Structure formats: structure tokens, C-alpha cells
Amino acid sequence: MNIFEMLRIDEGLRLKIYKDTEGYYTIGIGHLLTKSPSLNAAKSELDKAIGRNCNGVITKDEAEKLFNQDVDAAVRGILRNAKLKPVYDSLDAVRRCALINMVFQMGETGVAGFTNSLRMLQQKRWAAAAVNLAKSRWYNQTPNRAKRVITTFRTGTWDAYK
Ligand SMILES: [Cl-]
Numbered sequence: 001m002n003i004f005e006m007l008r009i010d011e012g013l014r015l016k017i018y019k020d021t022e023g024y025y026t027i028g029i030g031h032l033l034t035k036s037p038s039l040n041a042a043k044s045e046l047d048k049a050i051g052r053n054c055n056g057v058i059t060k061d062e063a064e065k066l067f068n069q070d071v072d073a074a075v076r077g078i079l080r081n082a083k084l085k086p087v088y089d090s091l092d093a094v095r096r097c098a099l100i101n102m103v104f105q106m107g108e109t110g111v112a113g114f115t116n117s118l119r120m121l122q123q124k125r126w127a128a129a130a131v132n133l134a135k136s137r138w139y140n141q142t143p144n145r146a147k148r149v150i151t152t153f154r155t156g157t158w159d160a161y162k
């Protein structure tokens with residue numbers, strides 16, 4: 001299992017603009033287009049992102065291209081971030097994937113705000129970190145996806161995804 005398979009399970013693949021769980025305009029494998037109500041702000045952001053007139057529809061190849069960009073942006077974002085980097089560096093490979101997962105979904109800024117959870121992970125206090133992570137809007141809004149990520153942090157294995 002790897003980061004790509006993991007995120008593909010959590011986000012799905014959609015070739016048509018669609019609205020995410022929060023009502024935001026998204027496409028492909030979890031690629032946020034805009035936080036704006038406007039479907040047109042979305043179709044435009046979309047053509048700008050793809051470099052063609054898409055009219056809200058992209059191909060598989062295009063979805064995977066955006067996905068590669070986003071995973072790469074997530075990983076570099078973490079490595080540049082004074083708060084995230086030390087956590088990432090202290091973790092084993094599987095748990096590193098779990099942190100990338102959260103960063104991909106909530107952005108660098110959102111995750112960096114999980115101060116206490118971050119401390120616990122860095123302290124290798126698995127069980128306590130799992131309990132803390134669950135006390136969040138994140139967990140309450142997308143519980144099944146959050147539980148899979150949380151179990152990943154707790155156990156250090158891919159069990160939740162297999
Ligand atoms: Cl809560």
C-alpha cells in the first residue's frame with residue numbers, strides 16, 4: 001500500500017466538478033477548486049489548473065496529473081513547515097503517510113493547528129494521540145475517513161486500509 005493508493009481510497013475519483021463534503025467545488029482525486037459558491041468561479045479555476053477549456057470535465061490522465069501535483073505539494077509543504085517537519089522526521093514510514101494524508105485533506109495550516117496531537121505523536125504516545133485527534137471537527141465531519149487515519153497513527157500498520 002502506498003500514499004497514492006491510500007489517498008485514492010479516501011478521496012475517490014471523480015471526472016466532473018462536484019461538491020465535497022463541505023459543499024466546495026472539487027474535481028479528480030480530492031482536488032479542491034474553490035471555496036466560492038460560484039460554479040463559475042469553479043469552472044474557471046478548473047481551466048486555469050488544466051490549461052484547457054474543460055467545461056467542468058477532465059480525463060483520468062488529467063485527474064492523476066493534479067493528484068501527483070497535490071501529493072508533492074503536500075509533502076514539500078510539510079518539509080518546509082517548522083511545526084510539521086519535526087513530527088514528520090520523528091515518525092516511521094506508515095505514520096508518515098498518515099500525516100501526509102491529513103495535510104492533503106486539510107492543508108498545512110489546519111494540521112499545524114493540532115498542537116497537542118502533534119506533541120503526542122512526536123512523543124510516540126500512540127493511544128493518547130488517537131484519543132486527542134478524535135476530539136475535532138474533522139473527526140465529527142468525516143468519521144470513517146478520520147478513523148482510518150487515526151488507526152493508522154495508533155497502530156503504525158495499513159490495517160485500516162486493507
Ligand atoms: Cl470534540
Ligand SMILES: [Cl-]
Pocket residue numbers: 141142143144145146
Ligand atoms: Cl468519512
